[PDB]
Symmetry: C3
Subunit: 409 residues, 3 copies
């Protein structure tokens, strides 16, 4: 009867349309910022870091190569010279097979043919159908010249794509960012006074109006603290929180990233650190009318984060972020979470940078989540409880989609 349960859980999980609440994808009409195709998959920064542990090619020479050459190098170094057993390499193969291509031939030239004959709009339809993803939440940074243009030009995203206002430059680099704000018309002063406060709010409000984001977000360092008499502390306290409450918009904090420990690696140069929970605890307790979405980078912060979620209902924890996005960790995190929170959390997000990743990110995660659900349902079944297929579909819907939409309101 566990196998009967297993088949129903797996079916429910596989058929449930997914709302990916955090990615780095863009509506196809936004242009080239939407990365896709086998060359992009292979040049994903997760693989750049991995190839540099093997190749004799210098990092400078690598960045000088064309994307085709980088992709050929990574394919040779990580798939041919050594078996592609890492999670990221495994992911590439899963994407290929899911698209109908054959990893058995190891024919990179043939795989490339598949992508060259399609348009971005077509590949988006293909991938979302294969990955069974109904909604994608973008990461939209108004401080990026390329992204900003699209929004200013009035471009509205595809109905399947949702905006999220990323604020890293504002919160973590205010000393430099303030000057850009001034150039844009927001009259922030040198001192943090009523004027600076109101203009920063104006800036946030203008972009909220323009993007209609499901939430505002920021990635924070292991040393994150709050309250704090710093630009970040003051902006969060005097501008972000008040504005988020007014529009009832959740604040997402991705905590634990130590930026650029290896600058030459670019996007692959970030490290991780354990953070104190004090700041998050204070925010949750002192701002009960604000909603917070949180995910942490350190493996050592995971359990206490689950416990904090038991304390505050205005906290919704989500995903297995970045360095946590590996089977061994996803499994332990998801089990600890269901054990202490039942179904009141968002188990995963893809964080996809390349369109096709939605296939492997969700395929790999769904199989793990399905196994966890099967164990948990079986435990209560052995206790005499009877679970209906509709209750399973309901639970699965909450985990992969409803909890998020319900939280953002």
């Amino acid at each position: 009867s566990r196998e009967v349960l297993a088949e129903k859980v797996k079916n429910a999980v596989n058929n449930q349309p997914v709302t990916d609440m955090h990615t780095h994808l863009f509506s196809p009409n936004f242009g080239e910022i939407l990365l896709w195709d086998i060359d992009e998959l292979l040049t994903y920064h997760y693989l750049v870091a991995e190839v540099m542990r093997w190749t004799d090619v210098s990092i400078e020479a690598f960045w000088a190569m064309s994307k085709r050459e980088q992709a050929d190098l990574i394919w040779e170094e990580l798939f041919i010279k050594r078996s592609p057993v890492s999670e990221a390499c495994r992911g590439v193969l899963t994407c290929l097979q899911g698209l109908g291509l054959d990893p058995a031939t190891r024919d990179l030239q043939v795989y490339r043919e598949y992508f060259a004959k399609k348009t971005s709009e077509e590949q988006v339809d293909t991938v979302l159908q294969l990955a069974n993803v109904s909604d994608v939440v973008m990461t939209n940074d108004p401080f990026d010249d390329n992204e900003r243009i699209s929004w200013l030009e009035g471009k509205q995203p595809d109905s399947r794509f949702h905006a999220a206002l990323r604020l890293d430059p504002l919160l973590n680099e205010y000393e430099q960012t303030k000057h850009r704000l001034r150039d844009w018309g927001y009259k922030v002063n040198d001192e943090w006074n009523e004027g600076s406060i109101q203009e920063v709010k104006r800036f946030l409000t203008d972009w909220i109006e323009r993007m209609d984001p499901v939430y505002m977000a920021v990635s924070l360092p292991p040393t994150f603290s709050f309250p704090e008499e710093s630009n970040r502390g003051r902006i969060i306290r005097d501008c972000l929180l008040p504005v988020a409450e007014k529009h009832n918009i959740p604040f997402a904090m991705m905590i634990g990233v130590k930026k650029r420990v290896h600058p030459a690696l670019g996007d692959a140069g970030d490290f991780v650190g354990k953070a104190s929970m004090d700041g998050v605890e204070h925010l949750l307790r002192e701002y009960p009318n604000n909603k917070f979405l949180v995910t942490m980078l350190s493996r050592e912060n995971q359990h206490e984060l689950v416990v904090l979620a038991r304390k505050f209902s205005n906290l919704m924890i989500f995903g297995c972020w970045w360095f946590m996005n590996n089977p061994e960790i996803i499994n332990e995190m998801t089990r600890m979470r269901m054990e202490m929170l039942g179904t009141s959390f968002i188990p995963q997000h893809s964080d996809a940078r390349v369109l096709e990743q939605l296939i492997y990110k969700w395929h790999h995660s769904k199989s793990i989540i399905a196994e966890v659900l099967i164990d948990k349902y079986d435990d209560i079944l052995q206790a005499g409880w009877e679970v209906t297929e509709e209750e399973i579909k309901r639970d699965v819907a909450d985990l992969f989609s409803r909890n998020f939409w319900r939280f953002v309101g």
Copy 2:
């Protein structure tokens, strides 16, 4: 032959009478402080925290409801609207089934009937028989007005119940507690001098004489330190340790709890934090004639605690406490412990607040411990070693009962 071993290990584990060395239960003759019945199980604070993550009912409104209404709300929110897959919810079902009730009907009114027709004394006999628990260690706090009365009135606990002198108010709130001591006749001065020292010892000795506790205990914060020029540091050094050595009574320290991070939740408002091992290390090494029972709340303290037990024989680690009491964690902790300590530790305690919890707490934990034992016995069996059924029963007896009684002496 692994299945032959499995059946013997499981049989031995299930038939071994358990000594629960830490609970919040009371001898039935102590009165109403002994909580029991389906309504109490459902209003366990672990479930209050969980229901607050789902219900639209305010925490104030919840505390205003009758226990019957709270129980109905929790049943509806956590068992009916979503599958009861969390560890605490699973536990309720296990208790129901163990009592002969049927979770399949989901008939809360029928379950309530079972409890209304029995006396506390009868339910105690029923539960201890079902849970196969021979001895229960209570948590007796002389600073609680309700508990204190029973002891002062000369009430002696049931032979199956043992006393443990809880000292949180004395050690963590001396500034306020000192005044109560004075009102009780213990002449502690404003300054920590010979007089204050002797009167605190007198207080401890009087209660040791009155309760005849198996150990003195205290829960400590993540910031716990020792030695320390504070009330706690001085009381432990000048009073607790000397008195514990004289009567050869162990000192139990439950470390890592951060009290009231969410006051409105009451008992469900405590958080957790990783502690430094420095204080425990110092205590173990500098007080070789004292015995220490230790359990920690942070997942990140578990492995180093096991290593410290390898260093000092006056340290006996026990259980998977509170936020650690979940399958995923219990499994990892128990395996790390057996691997580095063999059978020289106490794997679990229930921490039961409601009588019936003894059923699920021990049922859930025993099945995990049995699987760990089976793996470990199988590994040495494959090495050519032959384990007899009597040796298995012996090992199981040490884990679930003898190690504790042997340690407390």
Copy 3:
């Protein structure tokens, strides 16, 4: 087809000759420092710590017993009075069975007979053949009077044994060690100046020339930091690194050991602590022309160490050291590592102190690594990838031998 894969992975793993890159063994011709036989196995410090948690025999009385008596005590306490389920006890049995002895008889006197009729050279041939170990890396400390003699007398180690220059006394006890250096002719001054710098380099160079080590090593405390204006910080910066770069010799750092928390236990008296990654991060980034071999003692440092390896190619992480060398931990560590690094790491080393341990250390670890490999190969097989037996043998060769030799150059 998973079983077909399983048989090939297991075969490849078992047949792959192992290069043990860190042990405390010595070439047989070096003399008595090479410990071997059943009495040594039983008196391994891991077991001394374990027996002290059970026996009523004082630690002083234990150290006063002959090695035969200590071995009899440990056998009685840990194998007869309680089942030998701990990892270290399990290891002893694995060694016995591997040598052809029968753990079923529990006849210690008979086992002893096997060893008394052989020479060290013969047992070395026997063990290395059984453990399938082709190369052993020793730990050679020039500050030890016993070891130093052999080297000064011109003794060259067996071709299967390689030297590693251990520098703990120099780096962690310079204030005392400096005086010994002077007595040996190295004119280090009271102040850290050009003269002291050059003489410390001379000392390192002389021993590098004499030992021809594959790397220089040191064990460091949880509080390790760098850069640092201390003897250790200055010696590493001004002498060790420059010299290691010139001879292209890797620097091995075993971090997280807190020495002598329980002095009376001798070698069994060391504890563990979580370290900051700051020092390692700085060393890797600021000294790109230097190579670093790193292993950490704290379970809480493992994941971030893997992430740091993704950042820097001059970092090669290795093994599951000491308190990490237990199935539960080895399994989680190895899976996290393969998931984020593929095959670019050294999964294990034995750290053997007694010759026969090579049998169980490698037997226990190989079975775990084999299971991890099987899961990872199966995941990509399910993705459509086809792995050849030769590619498996290749991958296995990198993990157990080639990655190390390639890194040391």
